[PDB]
Amino acid sequence: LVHVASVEKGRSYEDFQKVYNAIALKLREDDEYDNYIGYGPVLVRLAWHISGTWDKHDNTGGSYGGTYRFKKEFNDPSNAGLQNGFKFLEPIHKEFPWISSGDLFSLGGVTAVQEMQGPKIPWRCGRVDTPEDTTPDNGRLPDADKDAGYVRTFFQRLNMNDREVVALMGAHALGKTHLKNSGYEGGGANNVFTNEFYLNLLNEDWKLEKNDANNEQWDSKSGYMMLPTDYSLIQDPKYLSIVKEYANDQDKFFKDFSKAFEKLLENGITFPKDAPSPFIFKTLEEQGL
Ligand code: HEM
Structure with missing residues (x-):
């Protein structure tokens, strides 16, 4: 085609x-x-x-x-x-x-x-x-209630590799989840593009909780949140390496996100x-x- x-x-x-x-x-x-x-x-x-x-x-x-x-x-x-x-x-x-x-x-x-x-x-x-x-x-x-293996496999269909997947997910620094849209609630509500998604993943204290739609999500006292698929990027050791790279290099993240x-x-x-x-x-x- x-x-x-x-x-x-x-x-x-x-x-x-x-x-x-x-x-x-x-x-x-x-x-x-x-x-x-x-x-x-x-x-x-x-x-x-x-x-x-x-x-x-x-x-x-x-x-x-x-x-x-x-x-x-x-x-x-x-x-x-x-x-x-x-x-x-x-x-x-x-x-x-x-x-x-x-x-x-x-x-x-x-x-x-x-x-x-x-x-x-x-x-x-x-x-x-x-x-x-x-x-x-x-x-x-893609589904949000899954793990690292699901994510990696999912994105193979869009011809994306580990680096591309982790880079793309950085867009979740933006906006928020809406319980009425996705069965997830919360989030940063930021409208400035930065590498904060990676910083938040590594630096926040995350608790696995159930939201009002009866779905599990990762919450921080600070008021941030992560989908199970977001959080899977620090459970998988390959994804974790890349999360730490982008958390420590704004320019590199910007360059890779742009390409991806x-x-x-x-x-x-x-x-x-x-x-x-x-x-x-x-x-x-x-x-x-
Ligand atoms: C495994 C991958 C992904 C999953 C499961 C997923 C899931 C979600 C879910 C459930 C929401 C909330 C929707 C709603 O309640 O309003 C969200 C929001 C959003 N997603 Fe993703 N997402 C993924 C990847 C991406 C990627 C690749 C991008 C773009 C590069 C992206 C961009 C965003 C942004 C910008 C929002 C905020 C929307 C707004 O605030 O209204 N997502 N996504």
């Missing part, structure tokens, strides 16, 4: 920076969302979940087709709460009707990471919307040899906007 990137007609870096800017401006404007966390974290999560359906074996799912817009996928129980991110992006898509859905969703994620002071994430245009019947079935996104997030967002896509180079968008702050 082959998906070839096709640039929206006539569009260049400048067009997509405009889209970036609109998303970034709306992120600053609608600052009250989720108890003043803002839409940053849910847009990152949306970009991952639209990409996380990918299957390297037959190239079903993946960000290319923009299939989150179809009910089967936006109603996936794994995607509960993502509708907020989609609703955010709706006026963006109305203003820039030329961008594809997959490009918009992935770009939402990139814009969110950068505006929250994360690393630059090179981004490539050219995803093309595909019909309803290409929508992957529910069930391809782009890869994630680009899985399944074939880029023509003469496609444009990846775009690196300036932040509003860099633009003085």
Whole structure:
């Protein structure tokens, strides 16, 4: 199954920076969302979940087709709460009707990471919307109540190795769990991208507790929380080594996260040899906007 990137007609870096800017401006404007966390974290999560359906074996799912817009996928129980991110992006898509859905969703994620002071994430245009019947079935996104072996195996389907998995999970520094979405509650509620997930894993005093939805989670007196799959990264000795590396090297984490997030967002896509180079968008702050 082959998906070839096709640039929206006539569009260049400048067009997509405009889209970036609109998303970034709306992120600053609608600052009250989720108890003043803002839409940053849910847009990152949306970009991952639209990409996380990918299957390297037959190239079903993946960000290319923009299939989150179809009910089967936006109603996936794994995607509960993502509708907020989609609703955010709706006026963006109305203003820039030329961008594809997959490009918009992935770009939402990139814009969110950068505006929250994360690393630059090179981004490539050219995803093309595909019909309803290409929508992957529910069930391809990962469970939270599992261990290190589950996590490692899960991510093999997205062609990610130990380093990539540990790097990607660092996004859980952002936002929080919502009992009504996932059966988990709590969390940092941070909207600044840093390597704190690793620091928290290593430095907090964690207690295995049951939440109000009758699910187990790791809680700290400090008020942080970790999913069983998060916590598995310090139970497994290979994952633990990498957790300690990122906890001790902000720049290294930023560099690896950037590589892994782009890869994630680009899985399944074939880029023509003469496609444009990846775009690196300036932040509003860099633009003085
Ligand atoms: C084994 C892997 C993963 C599991 C089981 C998982 C699970 C979860 C769960 C259950 C939530 C809370 C949803 C809700 O209640 O609102 C959460 C939140 C989130 N996830 Fe993950 N996740 C995983 C990996 C990732 C990765 C790879 C990314 C992105 C690079 C990511 C980004 C986030 C972020 C940004 C949120 C915060 C959402 C917001 O605050 O609304 N997740 N995830």
